[PDB]
Amino acid sequence: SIAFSRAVFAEFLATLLFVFFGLGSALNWPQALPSVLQIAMAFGLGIGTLVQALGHISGAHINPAVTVACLVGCHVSVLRAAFYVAAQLLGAVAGAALLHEITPADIRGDLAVNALSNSMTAGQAVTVELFLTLQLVLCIFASTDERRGENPGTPALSIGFSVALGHLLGIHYTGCSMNPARSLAPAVVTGKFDDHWVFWIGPLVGAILGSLLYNYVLFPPAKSL
Amino acid sequence: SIAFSRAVFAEFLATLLFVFFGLGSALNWPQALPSVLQIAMAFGLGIGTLVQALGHISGAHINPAVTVACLVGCHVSVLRAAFYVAAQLLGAVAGAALLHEITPADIRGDLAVNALSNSMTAGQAVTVELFLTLQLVLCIFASTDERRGENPGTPALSIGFSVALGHLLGIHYTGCSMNPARSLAPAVVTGKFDDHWVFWIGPLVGAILGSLLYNYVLFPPAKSLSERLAVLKGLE
Amino acid sequence: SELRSIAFSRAVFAEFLATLLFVFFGLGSALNWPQALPSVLQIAMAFGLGIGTLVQALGHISGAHINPAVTVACLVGCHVSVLRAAFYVAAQLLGAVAGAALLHEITPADIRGDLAVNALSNSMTAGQAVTVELFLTLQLVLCIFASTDERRGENPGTPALSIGFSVALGHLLGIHYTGCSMNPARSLAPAVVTGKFDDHWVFWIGPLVGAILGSLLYNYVLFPPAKSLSE
Amino acid sequence: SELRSIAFSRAVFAEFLATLLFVFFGLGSALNWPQALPSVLQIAMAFGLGIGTLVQALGHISGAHINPAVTVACLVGCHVSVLRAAFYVAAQLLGAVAGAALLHEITPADIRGDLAVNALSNSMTAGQAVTVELFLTLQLVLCIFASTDERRGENPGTPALSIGFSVALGHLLGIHYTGCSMNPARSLAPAVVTGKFDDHWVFWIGPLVGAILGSLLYNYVLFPPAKSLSERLAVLK
Question: Which residues lie on this side of the membrane: Extracellular (chain C)?
Answer without folding.
Answer: 32-39, 107-126, 176-179, 193-200
